[PDB]
Amino acid sequence: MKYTGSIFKRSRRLGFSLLENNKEFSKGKKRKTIPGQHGNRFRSSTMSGYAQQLQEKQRMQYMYGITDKQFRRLFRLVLKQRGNLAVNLFRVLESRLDNIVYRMGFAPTRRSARQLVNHGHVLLNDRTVDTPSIILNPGDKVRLKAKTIKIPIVKAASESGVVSPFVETNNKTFEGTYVRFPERSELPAGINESYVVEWYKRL
Amino acid sequence: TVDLINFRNFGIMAHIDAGKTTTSERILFHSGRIHKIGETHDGESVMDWMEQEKERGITITSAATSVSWKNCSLNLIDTPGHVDFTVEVERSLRVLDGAIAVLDAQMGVEPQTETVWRQASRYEVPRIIFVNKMD
Amino acid sequence: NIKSNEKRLRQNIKRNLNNKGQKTKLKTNVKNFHKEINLDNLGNVYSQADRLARKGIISTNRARRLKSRNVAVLNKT
Amino acid sequence: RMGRVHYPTYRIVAVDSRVKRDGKYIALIGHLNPALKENKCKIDEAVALEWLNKGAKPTDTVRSLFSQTGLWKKFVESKK
Amino acid sequence: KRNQRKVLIGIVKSTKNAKTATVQVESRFKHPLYHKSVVRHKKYQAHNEGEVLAKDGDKVQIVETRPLSATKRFRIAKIIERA
RNA sequence: UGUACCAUUUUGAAUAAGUGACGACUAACUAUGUGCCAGCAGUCGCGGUAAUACAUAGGUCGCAAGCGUUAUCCGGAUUU
RNA sequence: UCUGAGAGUUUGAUCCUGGCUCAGGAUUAACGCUGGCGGCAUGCCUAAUACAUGCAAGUCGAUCGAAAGUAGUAAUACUUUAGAGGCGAACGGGUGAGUAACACGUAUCCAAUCUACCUUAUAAUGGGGGAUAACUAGUUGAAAGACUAGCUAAUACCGCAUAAGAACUUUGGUUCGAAUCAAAGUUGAAAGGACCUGCAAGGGUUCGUUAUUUGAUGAGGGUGCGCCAUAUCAGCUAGUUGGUGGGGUAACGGCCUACCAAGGCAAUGACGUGUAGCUAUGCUGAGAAGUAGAAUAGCCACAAUGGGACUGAGACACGGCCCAUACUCCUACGGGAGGCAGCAGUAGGGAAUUUUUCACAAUGAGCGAAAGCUUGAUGGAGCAAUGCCGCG
Numbered sequence A: 001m002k003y004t005g006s007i008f009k010r011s012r013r014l015g016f017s018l019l020e021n022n023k024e025f026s027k028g029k030k031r032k033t034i035p036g037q038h039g040n041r042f043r044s045s046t047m048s049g050y051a052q053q054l055q056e057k058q059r060m061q062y063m064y065g066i067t068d069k070q071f072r073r074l075f076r077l078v079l080k081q082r083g084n085l086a087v088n089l090f091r092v093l094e095s096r097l098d099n100i101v102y103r104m105g106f107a108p109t110r111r112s113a114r115q116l117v118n119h120g121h122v123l124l125n126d127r128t129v130d131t132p133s134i135i136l137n138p139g140d141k142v143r144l145k146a147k148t149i150k151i152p153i154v155k156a157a158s159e160s161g162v163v164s165p166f167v168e169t170n171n172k173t174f175e176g177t178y179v180r181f182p183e184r185s186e187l188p189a190g191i192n193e194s195y196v197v198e199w200y201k202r203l
Numbered sequence B: 001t002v003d004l005i006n007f008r009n010f011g012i013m014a015h016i017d018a019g020k021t022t023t024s025e026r027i028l029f030h031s032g033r034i035h036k037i038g039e040t041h042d043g044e045s046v047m048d049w050m051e052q053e054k055e056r057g058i059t060i061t062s063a064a065t066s067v068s069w070k071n072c073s074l075n076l077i078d079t080p081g082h083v084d085f086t087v088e089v090e091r092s093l094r095v096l097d098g099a100i101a102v103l104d105a106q107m108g109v110e111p112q113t114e115t116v117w118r119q120a121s122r123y124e125v126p127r128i129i130f131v132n133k134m135d
Numbered sequence C: 001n002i003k004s005n006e007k008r009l010r011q012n013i014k015r016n017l018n019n020k021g022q023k024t025k026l027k028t029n030v031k032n033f034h035k036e037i038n039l040d041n042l043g044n045v046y047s048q049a050d051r052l053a054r055k056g057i058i059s060t061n062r063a064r065r066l067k068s069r070n071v072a073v074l075n076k077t
Numbered sequence D: 001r002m003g004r005v006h007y008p009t010y011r012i013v014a015v016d017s018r019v020k021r022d023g024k025y026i027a028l029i030g031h032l033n034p035a036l037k038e039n040k041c042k043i044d045e046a047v048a049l050e051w052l053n054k055g056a057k058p059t060d061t062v063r064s065l066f067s068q069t070g071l072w073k074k075f076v077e078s079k080k
Numbered sequence E: 001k002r003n004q005r006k007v008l009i010g011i012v013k014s015t016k017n018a019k020t021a022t023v024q025v026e027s028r029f030k031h032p033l034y035h036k037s038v039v040r041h042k043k044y045q046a047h048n049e050g051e052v053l054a055k056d057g058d059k060v061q062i063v064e065t066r067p068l069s070a071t072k073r074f075r076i077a078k079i080i081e082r083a
Numbered sequence F: 001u002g003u004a005c006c007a008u009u010u011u012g013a014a015u016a017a018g019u020g021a022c023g024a025c026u027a028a029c030u031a032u033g034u035g036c037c038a039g040c041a042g043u044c045g046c047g048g049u050a051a052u053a054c055a056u057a058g059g060u061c062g063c064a065a066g067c068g069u070u071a072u073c074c075g076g077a078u079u080u
Numbered sequence G: 001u002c003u004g005a006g007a008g009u010u011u012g013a014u015c016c017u018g019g020c021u022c023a024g025g026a027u028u029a030a031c032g033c034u035g036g037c038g039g040c041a042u043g044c045c046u047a048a049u050a051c052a053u054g055c056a057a058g059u060c061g062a063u064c065g066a067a068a069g070u071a072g073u074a075a076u077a078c079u080u081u082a083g084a085g086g087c088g089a090a091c092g093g094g095u096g097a098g099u100a101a102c103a104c105g106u107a108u109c110c111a112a113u114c115u116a117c118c119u120u121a122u123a124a125u126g127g128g129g130g131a132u133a134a135c136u137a138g139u140u141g142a143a144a145g146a147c148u149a150g151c152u153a154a155u156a157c158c159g160c161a162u163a164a165g166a167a168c169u170u171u172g173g174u175u176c177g178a179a180u181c182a183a184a185g186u187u188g189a190a191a192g193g194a195c196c197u198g199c200a201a202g203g204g205u206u207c208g209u210u211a212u213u214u215g216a217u218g219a220g221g222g223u224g225c226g227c228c229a230u231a232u233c234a235g236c237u238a239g240u241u242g243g244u245g246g247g248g249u250a251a252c253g254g255c256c257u258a259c260c261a262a263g264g265c266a267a268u269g270a271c272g273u274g275u276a277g278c279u280a281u282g283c284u285g286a287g288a289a290g291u292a293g294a295a296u297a298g299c300c301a302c303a304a305u306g307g308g309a310c311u312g313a314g315a316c317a318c319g320g321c322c323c324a325u326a327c328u329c330c331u332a333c334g335g336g337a338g339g340c341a342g343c344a345g346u347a348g349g350g351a352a353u354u355u356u357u358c359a360c361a362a363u364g365a366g367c368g369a370a371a372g373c374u375u376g377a378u379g380g381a382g383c384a385a386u387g388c389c390g391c392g
Helices: A007-013 A049-063 A068-079 A085-094 A097-103 A110-118 A152-159 A194-198 B020-031 B054-059 B087-095 B114-120 C003-035 C039-055 C060-076 D047-053 D063-068 D071-078
Strands: A122-124 A141-144 A168-170 A175-177 B007-012 B065-069 B072-077 B098-103 B127-131 D010-012 D030-032 E010-017 E020-030 E037-047 E058-069 E072-079
Touching: A049 A194, A068 A085, A085 A097, A085 A194, A097 A110, A097 A122, A097 A141, A110 A152, B007 B020, B007 B087, B007 B098, B020 B054, B020 B065, B020 B072, B020 B098, B072 B087, B087 B114, B098 B114, C003 C039, C003 C060, C039 C060, D047 D071, D063 D071, E010 E037, E020 E058, E037 E058
Parallel strands: B007 B072, B098 B127, E037 E072
Antiparallel strands: A122 A141, A141 A175, A168 A175, B065 B072, D010 D030, E010 E020, E010 E058, E020 E037, E058 E072
8 A cells, every 4th residue: 555544554553653642542442453353472483673674664654655666766866865874765755745745734644635735736846746746855835726725624734733843834824844854853753764774685 | 533423333233153253354354454464365255164153253252343444433343252141242232333233044043133133222223234144 | 762772873884884994994004004114104004093083983092003013013124 | 859758858969971860970069959049068169160170060950059159250261 | 110019029939931920928817706817828920021030939029010911910020039 | 739737627535456475484364164185385395083374254464556476687595 | 895684404302514495676578467647768589581561861953955834926934854964872770690800998000091072272163076865766565675776965975285282203311111301204184054243354153073182081901908608629720821023902911823832820728619799888786796788879790692893982782783592473474573680560489579650840961052852860659557657
């Protein structure tokens, strides 16, 4: 999946709350482990470096809602620039158009954010994106098109916008500026991209 | 090209065992007479030594052969080579603006010219009855 | 197929006839020089070679080399 | 032009009497897009003079780009 | 000759041909994998211009040129004689 | 090329899902038939007195308009 | 240092020796399943086999006589040249059969080599004579073709004038297999068509040619360096090996020959053998190295195989010619014919390898003062998730 259709499952099983109390939430049933008839501490050797590298990769590319092919495309594009794979890769992944639109507080869910930005109502670099594939940079102004300034769901989301020490959003005008990269301290606490760094052996 | 009035199609409106394809080849050679290639002495005469008529029906079958004859364009089409069926004779009839009905005198007992005539008589298309078995 | 290929075929076959004639005349002048070896025939060969080099069929190097070989025989006499 | 459609990239090269574009060239004239009216070509009023004085005039579509540099205004009297 | 410097120096071996010498050149190249210098032997046909004759059993300097005879595409240039 | 880009230009959750396998190597497995038969399988190797590796229902993860498969060079084998 | 994965395989158990496997990018892909678009780029490795079909460089009168007719009584304003003659025809593209090498990468010897237009410009377009096609007539002819007879123009064929410069004889000078200059012998450049002014001359004006001459252009032979396999291939090689003379492609070169000769390569394995098109470019890994040089840019090779000649500056010429060999159509069995290893596309093997592709719009050449034309080169497009890319 580059998508979902029951996100609460992914949030609970990955061990990371994609929404803190809106995806690992008491909405009836609520879980924090692997669900089903196979909830089990597998005595078979299912745990190694490979396993946790995979698990962290799952968490990171399922909180974004983005496809893995664009994950590898971002890795390759950053490979054109010398630096550190871990921090640069995670910062570029955070700088995803849909991820940043959600970070603005413009959509209740990453899937909904992706659907909205694809719908042709997000202006970036004076280009209304018909496909949310434009990776932001520090200071990239995302604008909400004239259509999505009258949409009730994203109106309520935007009016409840989220500000962080590395972005800011003007919710009344439905606009957002990606202030800076989350360098090493504004990243999620239970998420580590270094595993994806060590996931390769062909560097 | 030749005038619109002079675009007339003609399908061989008969069946084999009647000297049909012999007459079709005769008409094709008569209206397709060209001498710069030497064809005049290459298909001069056509006649049977008939012990097989399938060869006559097949090898001479003209699916669509167009020529010109001084006043008009003659579209000779010998699609039918079967004794009794409807597809080839019917497409020939649909194409032709006029029909030639190849009948017999030596073998007047040919059974499958009634249905061919009835098919041609549906659209009232002009028909010329021609008999070649008189030898 | 290119019509200009056959056009240059016509032109080059006529050039074939003309150049056969002219090169045969030059070679018979060279033969006459090599038979009666003298400066006058050397000058005739020089004039013929200059004419052929001016025509622009074969480069002047062949004319110069053939006349140098002729005048070498001249110096041998 | 060449490359990707609706994003053409014209690579201008040299020729004597037979050779194609961007194949065998005496010297790469430079890069101009047919959709771009200004060239980043290797044109400095010197290579053009080299190509003219050495014979084998290059492709006949950057003549205006050489005209803007005044190449002809000196060459047509240098030859004279 | 205006001919410029090119390396063809070697030990001339024989002059059994009329004013033509066979020269043995020992050229050292490098092993591509194990990285050790190894020598190889080559033969060259140097043309003796008639005014110079390659004295055999010695080192001679050959220099490149257009062919002089069949499989004779070099001319002898310099010689170091016996001592 | 009436292409490209623009403007919910209009109604609408609507317009698109498949693959591997879950014992390890190397993430994904609980039950049902099955007596080394059925069938699985790249290595270990799986089934002969109750099957989570087989076959299936299913849940599961890796993905995805591509999914798995073999193909092909080196390194993971300093295991030339 | 950018950088580097492990586990599983044996004896009751332990280890060791050694080996195999998955664990990675990546597709001319294909393949199951199904399928969103477009962008984007890919697209016979095998078959270099024939190539059917269109197509793969056309432009020329400002070179010419007339053909040929629109308006005109005609002359002629006018259309191009069938034909003579000009350039490009070798461009382009293709595959790599074969080619393992100066082809290549690199500096060069070129003392031996030209290059048409072009280019550094000095010299020229003086003057003709007569043809020849076009045109006309006859002939063989089913056509294919085909011979004979004449006429005429030019930028057409063939001499001379001038002709710096220059080719090239004899002497001096100078010079690292010749550079350089003085004296001096011989000797040769055609061709003019067209437009305005001017009686004309002349001036302006555009083509076509002329020598001389700085280079490019394509390439020539050699060239140190490296350039596949080949010992379960050890001897191979009679221009072999080199010399004088003569001839020779553009030229040095036994390039080739008369004459004179017996030597040349080689256990660091000679010769032979078959193959790969070589460099840049194509991936994997840190690295060692391996993996193709398919197609491609350069070069190189065939362009149905093997010759010959001509042209062109460069060809012994894919789409010129003649021929032998493979083939073929029609036919009255007399006869004539050509090549996609050009584009596609066809036939096949394969898993499959694109249009039986559009305009020269932009870009190349070629040529025309110029209008411009063609390119199956190019630029597009189709085409198959064909591969990547993003999307829901």
